[PDB]
Design a protein around this ligand. Structure first.
Ligand code: ENN
Ligand code: ZN
Length: 257
């Protein structure tokens, strides 16, 4: 089955998911000189005051912090979006070293990791219907660099030992995702896809310009996770990122600048 290796990693995905070679795949390199400042773009509105985190889960590709998305609670709007998009989960992608790990790149720079806050368009009623639509999802992407710790990250890191292996889940209530955001909401945006199989071309990407800083110790705990399940040989969960894909006929827009 797909994963991040030589025999089942990103260069193999297209055999099961031919959409991998499509016209609006993610991630991309954000060439900052070529991105268009669009004065028509709005501030992004991130309303996470009532977010209800529920569970943290090791799905075997990354970990997901899940939210109760059955009410209008944690929503993304504005920016390039029409409508309202409700938060369902976040997860990260990260490297084996600090010099790699992000999916998007900025003038070919790789960050140590990238946070994805996944939201679905309420006009489609649920996530599963949204992913079948070209405007179904909005992903807020945030780069991580290694430096000073991110205090609002520590609750996530400290639960990771309880979800080491694939399949594990732990109650994870009262986690506030506002503690993962940078100061600025300046962003780039473009139409793209999920970066994991099934690679559906349903995402408006919103990538923040300002990274957050996390400590070496915090990203070292992400790298202790395992891609395998309990009782199977250890394969550390590192380098769970898909490389930049061809931009093809797309324009990246800047909200700033
Ligand atoms: C079958 C699930 C395999 C793991 N991937 C995800 O959880 C996932 C990743 C993105 S990403 N990496 O594009 O943000 C999105 Cl938008 C939506 C989901 Cl569902
Ligand atoms: Zn992701």
């Amino acid at each position: 089955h797909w994963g991040y290796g030589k025999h089942n990693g990103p260069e193999h995905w297209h055999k099961d998911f031919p959409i991998a070679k499509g016209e609006r795949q993610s991630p991309v390199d954000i060439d900052t000189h070529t991105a268009k400042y669009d004065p028509s773009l709005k501030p992004l509105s991130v309303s996470y005051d009532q977010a209800t985190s529920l569970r943290i889960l090791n799905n075997g590709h990354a970990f997901n912090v899940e939210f109760d998305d059955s009410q209008d609670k944690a929503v993304l709007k504005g920016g390039p979006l029409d409508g309202t998009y409700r938060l369902i989960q976040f997860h990260f992608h990260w490297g084996s070293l600090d010099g790699q790990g992000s999916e998007h790149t900025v003038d070919k720079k790789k960050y140590a990791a990238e946070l994805h806050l996944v939201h679905w368009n309420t006009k489609y009623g649920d996530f599963g219907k949204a992913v079948q639509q070209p405007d179904g999802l909005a992903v807020l992407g945030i780069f991580l660099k290694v430096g000073s710790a991110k205090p609002g990250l520590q609750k996530v890191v400290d639960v990771l030992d309880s979800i080491k292996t694939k399949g594990k889940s732990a109650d994870f209530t009262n986690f506030d995702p506002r503690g993962l955001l940078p100061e600025s909401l300046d962003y780039w945006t473009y139409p793209g896809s999920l970066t994991t199989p099934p690679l559906l071309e349903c995402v408006t990407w919103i990538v923040l310009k300002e990274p957050i800083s996390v400590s070496s110790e915090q990203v070292l705990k992400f790298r202790k996770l395992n891609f395998n399940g309990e009782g199977e040989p250890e394969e550390l969960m590192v380098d769970n990122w898909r490389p930049a894909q061809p931009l093809k006929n797309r324009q990246i827009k800047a909200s700033f600048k």
